Design a protein around this ligand. Sequence first.
Ligand SMILES: O=P(O)(O)[C@H](F)[C@@H]1O[C@H](CO)[C@@H](O)[C@H](O)[C@H]1O
Ligand SMILES: [Mg+2]
Length: 215
Amino acid sequence: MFKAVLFDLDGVITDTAEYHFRAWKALAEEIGINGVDRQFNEQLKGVSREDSLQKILDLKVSAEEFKELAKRKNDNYVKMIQDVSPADVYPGILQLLKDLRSNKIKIALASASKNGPFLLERMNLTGYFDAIADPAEVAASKPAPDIFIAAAHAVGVAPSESIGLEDSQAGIQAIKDSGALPIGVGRPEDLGDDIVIVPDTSHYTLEFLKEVWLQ
Ligand SMILES: O=P(O)(O)[C@H](F)[C@@H]1O[C@H](CO)[C@@H](O)[C@H](O)[C@H]1O
Ligand SMILES: [Mg+2]
C-alpha cells in the first residue's frame, strides 16, 4: 500500500492557483505584456517564482527590474491571500487528511511556494502535515523531481511508495520523474490522457487513492 501522499498546494488544497494567475497577469500587463491568459498560465502552474517571471518576460529587463517585478507580484499576491480561511479548503481535502492520518499514511507538502506555510496556517491545516518540503532548499524546482523526492524523504518513505497530487503540467512531470504515482486534478486537455486525472478534488478520497493504487 502507498505509505505517503505528497501534496501540491496551489490548485490542489485550495484555489490559490487562480490568485497566482490574476497576480501574474496584472504584473505582465503593467509592463506591456498581454499574453498571460488562462492557456499561457498552464505554463506557470507549479513553476518557481523566478522561472515564472522569466517565462512571462520571454514574451529584456535589468537585473534590478527583474528583482523588483518578482517582489511586486508577490507583494500583490500576499495581499490577495490575507483573508483565506478554513472555508476555502477545497472539497474532499480536509477529510482526506483526516483519513490518511487515521490510516497511518504520511502527509507531506511539495509546493513551490514560499507562501505555503502561511496558507496552511490560514486554513488550519498545518497540524495534518508530517512535513513541509522547503522549496528554497532544493537545487532544482518543478518540473525537476527534487521537491517531491524531498517531501517523501522528509517523512521517511520512498517516492515509489508515494502518491503525488498535482494540478499542473510541470508538477505532473516532476512526480513522474520522482518515481511517485501521480493523480492529477483538472482537465485532460491541460494535463494529458496518460495518467489518472480527476475533474475536481472531491474525487481525492482515500477510497479512490486505494482504487488507483491497486489498478
Ligand atoms: O508563491 P511563490 O511565488 O513563492 C511560488 F513560486 C509560486 O508557486 C506556484 C505553484 O505553487 C506557481 O504557480 C507560481 O507561479 C509561483 O509564483
Ligand atoms: Mg499547483
